[PDB]
Amino acid sequence: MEAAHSKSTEECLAYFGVSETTGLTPDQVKRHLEKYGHNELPAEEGKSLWELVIEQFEDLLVRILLLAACISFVLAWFEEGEETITAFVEPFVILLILIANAIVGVWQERNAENAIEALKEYEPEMGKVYRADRKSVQRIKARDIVPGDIVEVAVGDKVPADIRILSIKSTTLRVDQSILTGESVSVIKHTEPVPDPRAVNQDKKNMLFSGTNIAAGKALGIVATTGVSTEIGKIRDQMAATEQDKTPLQQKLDEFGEQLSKVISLICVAVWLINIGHFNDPVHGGSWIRGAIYYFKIAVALAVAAIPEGLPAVITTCLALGTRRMAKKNAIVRSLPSVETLGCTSVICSDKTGTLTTNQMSVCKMFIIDKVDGDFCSLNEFSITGSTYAPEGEVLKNDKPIRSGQFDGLVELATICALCNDSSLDFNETKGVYEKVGEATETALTTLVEKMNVFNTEVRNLSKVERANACNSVIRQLMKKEFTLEFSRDRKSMSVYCSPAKSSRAAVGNKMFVKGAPEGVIDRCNYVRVGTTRVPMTGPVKEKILSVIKEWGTGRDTLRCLALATRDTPPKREEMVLDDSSRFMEYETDLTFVGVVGMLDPPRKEVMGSIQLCRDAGIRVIMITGDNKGTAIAICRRIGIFGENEEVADRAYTGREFDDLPLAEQREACRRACCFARVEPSHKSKIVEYLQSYDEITAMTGDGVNDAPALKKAEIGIAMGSGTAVAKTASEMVLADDNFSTIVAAVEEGRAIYNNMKQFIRYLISSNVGEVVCIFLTAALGLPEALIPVQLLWVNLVTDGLPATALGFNPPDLDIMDRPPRSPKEPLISGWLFFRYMAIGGYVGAATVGAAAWWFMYAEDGPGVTYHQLTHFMQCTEDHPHFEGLDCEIFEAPEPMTMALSVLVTIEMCNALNSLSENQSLMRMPPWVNIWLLGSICLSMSLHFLILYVDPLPMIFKLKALDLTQWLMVLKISLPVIGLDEILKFIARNYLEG
Template sequence: VFGRAQAVVTSTGMNTEFGKIAGAVQAMDEKKTPLSIKLDVFAKKLGIIIVGLCGIIFLLEIVEHGAGIEAVIEGFMTAIALAVSAVPEALPALVIVTLALGARDLAGRNAIIRRLASAETLGSTTVICADKTGTLSRGEMTVRKLYINNQIVDVSGIGYEPKGEFHASNLLINPQEDMHLTLLLRIGALCNDSNYDGKTIRGDSTEGALIVVAVKAQMNESVLRAQYPRVDELPFSSERKLMTTIHSTPKGRKIAYVKGAPEVIIKKCIHIIEDNTVNKFTADKKNEVLKNNESLASQAFRMLGMAYKDLPDNLQDFTEKIVENNLVFVGLEAMIDPPREEAAKAIAMCKQAGIRNVMITGDHKLTAMAIAKELGMMDDEHNIALTGAELEKLSDEEYDKIVDDVVVYARVSPMHKLKIVEALKKKGEIVAMTGDGVNDAPALKRADIGVAMGITGTDVSKEAADMILADDNYATLVNAVEGGRSIYDNIRKYIRFLLSCNFDELLVIGAWTIAGFPLPLLPIQILFINLVTDGPPAIALSVDPPAKDVMKRPPRNPKAGIFHGMFVFMLVSFLVQSAGSSICFAYGMFILNDYTKATTMTFLQVAFFELFVLWNCRSETQSVWRLGRDNLKNKFFVLSVVACFIFTLCLPYIPILSSAFHIVPLTITELGLVLSLSSLGLFILPELLFGKKFLRWT
């Protein structure tokens, strides 16, 4: 809402138009994140497999030992212990811890996560739709060029500094001596709702730039407003693309000052000032002005046209139809909001990561395209720029055909954003959308990741968003995507480790039980492995630092399962560990003829193998041998693995603990065999096994 008025309050809160938007946003179904969908599918499949296998082992125990009460209880306890071992019951806690730690890290980078699961969803983003002003650009408009009398006037100065000079054809000019230039600057300063205190702007940055350039010409804002008091106004609207203010002149006359989109202003003008003379604004002259406007717009300048109209002294009804027609064209003001340097780097990083960048702006199409090219967004001949008007003319089918090629949306309204989001999601994209206004809220809610602005954003937009950028910076959003990818990687590491190591116990126990032998692992030993070796070291994976290539990989396939590409790695690990456990048990049973030593060796081999293979679960492309010093970056991981290894190694040699776990001390030879078989976990190399297909569905 813009302008000034006296209003009668007819409704408040949720009954207002803003309240209705907020209500519509709240009524939208809460979207499930890609991670939650994948975990649901994973949990169902895993549950069916584990229940089935444990049921089979329970039946085998009954067949082997009979249906007596003791045999049934022992078989049931074994099946339950195996189920507890196989089920990654720590997964929900680990996911929450990983997301929480990731959200804390992102908050330190000015990305505040409002919904915890969204921290991971960021990592799967395939398209980022960002507002230009303040996000891709600095948000500090500066008037650099003026167009009057068929010539370009250059204006020096940076940002909101009130110092600058005016040059035409490389000659310094004094604005106070040029009535035409003075009129142009006066219109910009008075048809304006912002305020300037000499250092900062209070209000819209575009309007602030118009005041600053007038101050550079020694025109005092307060003096101007006193000399030309405002009588009435027609506030700016995105439909009209104009703003008009009516003033009393020092001579007591009434005059309308109009600013707005040049193409709209020019259509409404019938005269033009040239050399301080009002002449007819012919079609040829209009085309010449439009050509200069397009030339400046193509250089990334935001263009505003300025015009005026003398009004009858007795006019009291200041309507659009009366005031905003038959105007006198004065000139153009060209301003620029320079792109953020870090935004260009962030966009380049997105390209490496396979993420598409889309700019959304209210600027002229040519201005938006110039900024996009400067940022490196439009570097393909197939890239398209669309205006809001062009978008409205397209049918849904026509738009669906080109939506993948559109990288710039110019002259769009907030409601167009919703259409853009829905079209991209229909294509299977994971969409991040930025916004700061109340009308942006539906699009933010509909997007997979709604991103509100912390500085310029409204409360409604922040409420609808999944994430808030505290510094309104595009680079922060891209850094958050990097953090989201790291979070997902760490969750996959944990799942890969658990599935690689937990199922061997089912195979070993099932196979030896079928063969008529006693249990290779006792229930209490299984629970120890599950709680200790599967505990702190695995949880430490949640704080692993991001991989060096995390933003050099394409976005993951939204349809791919959570353990996509890791089946062969898990299968090899499962078979190697099962073979090692069976060798240890067979050595104890057949060579040593000692069941207790057999279970001790099997227990230690399983525990140590998991602690060794864990090192190869930290990367999908590099084994422990290639990570080098990066192996030691996560100190919590290193300390937890070492501590668990030492504690497990000491168990057989501490009487009270060895008795509790039904294990006995081993000789050097026996321990050497256990460690030799366990250390094979260091040779389950992810760079050889990841992404390989064993069966078509893997």
């Protein structure tokens, strides 16, 4: 049944053809249970083992290495019996890495808390219904409830389904709907219809929602919807956002593999075209059946050369290091690839209650009468400090401490607040903090009484647990509450009838203490207290009282105001019909006005500053709350989102106002407006979606289950440490200390981490460019293998792996947080940097091939044809007497390759220092800036010589020690790489853009 809230009780009963006195018959239940299903939220799954594994091998790059490793495995078996003992090294090293980087990928995904599981914790196991079977209520399984049955809820129950209220048995029904609105203030329900078909949850005061709980009262209703069709069901469906979207950096890495997989094949085509005269001459060695082993050889070397095999490892290591750094700042990260994204954040959406605020009602202002003289009426106003339920804070007057006890009026004020109260304070020794017991707006009064300590009761020695209600207990020892005239909607006030508990206060006699909506209470007052005296209520006194109350309730204050009063001469206990609330207004007449208290859910201390720091970094902050527009806007001004007098006509909307706008306007409002109130959970995700529609990196901060959808939809969901489990499980980060400042620190961390990643990524990929150039030269020029896949993997995994990791340790800039968010589509390298790295690559591709060709010609260890006939080295065994005159196994010597590898390694160790800064010379920024980089290079060279000396290695790597003359050659062709890059920088740092 849709729109049950807009229908009358009769119509809802008629809709299901059920009687409120009997309920559904077993046949109806069976029927409805077949049509509507069971009243439960469906669990989730899909993490199929034979699926999450296939995903690890879904990347275009990992597939190329998968194929390559296989092709390399076939060439290992179909290998000569020369030394096929260590030929499968390469095929296994690759397969090892793949299954390694793949098994880890399943680890981060298998280990994931389900937000749905946490949400289902709000679904009660049992429910109470009235069926045709019995006349007495039946306590059955909540999941067995169905649309149409008559349900009963009472204090403490967790609402079992979305229900249309039929009849309230208590004076009022109090409901805590915080899971849908984020507010803990209990809402007063009624049974009248709510006309508006587009009404929001907070407007549906005649409905009870599944997952919510009853704070007080008892009522009967009819189930309208169950399962996924409920409000918490909408939250659940939204949480089912399985479609995983990749971050900007991840997107940049995917396009890289795209073009890479193209260039690879493109080069493979070039090679198959450069060798035109291959099968043109009578060749018998190159079998058409078995001869393509030449291409399946280079095809492998090419892939291994282009793919930065070690990149995915250095990224995770860098992110892991960053994650620990943030945890140090009380920022627990649940998603590693989030650290980077947070730094790209341009818009931070934020919940208010419990996130921006403490979610702890606090009385911050109060007043009593000061003087009365005809038309003149002055007041004694005080402010109160503290933003929590803890009895910590002072009462000030003119920003100066005072003793509440000194003012008689305050003594009565406190007495009313202590007695006309149904809540209390409790110290949670486990969590080490004071918590409320009962309603928030009532506990604020309790807490208030503890701060005022009107009787100057000694509380220093007392402990936490004892301090919690020390002053309130003092007043209860003086005046006893005999009974309560519970609050009722028709009167909007409540009172307690009390009498002295000691003959020492006999003069007070019977008194009724009243509190409530100001207007009604004040109208029922005929007197006003002035100290311990009392004078009549006059027009001037009344207007003075109301005028101040009006200011407190709608300006920079916008406080929730309560008027406090006491009937000095109440009726006889026997003249009061206590079971008929409709009589209570009359008993609360002829009152004496005592004072007013003003309270609010206060912003956290570090929020205002945090907002400003965000703004400096070009980061906008938008409030999205389930609370009302008025207080939402007031808080925006308090924390700086809006200026003190800024016009907010079109910069603030309620959920209903927002939906009223056309889809087009809705989209733009999200860019201009900074405040959305009276919102439903779907509104928050909707606005986040709109922001993202403009390709903005948006974050969401929240604490309630009503923030879940939005926390999920956002690129970075940030949850409060003291928030709900649902919010935490749906977020990428958790602020363990609920300190908003941590968000700014996390953003900075994210920008600093990215700048370094942007470096070692360029360093690594730059290296792969040279490696591919080499393979291309030593293939087109028909020269002998200068480098083999086994050699390349070691370079891209260890040799450069360490230096890359060390680059992630570069010191961050100073103006990092003083600059605007970087565009998400910003390319890691293009323009001048493209050409700049286009050259460095060409160089490396020549320094390696040349270092190999050098040994085969001008070296003093194996001279060759100084006429480049080294190209036809292949035709040495076929026609030896041609132009040889030496062993043919010379074109496989370890000397030439070792020469090339030492050039590559040395060039990279030097190109690492070139990576310490983009456009800054190593002189303007010395290498010793990053002690880790230096220590990194040393660990690399040592591991390099390790492969040239430890006998069991040179064999598998096909390498061989070098002379002091050999090495000199390397340092002569590598070292100049620093000069080249140092020059390219100048070309831009002093011309292009510098």
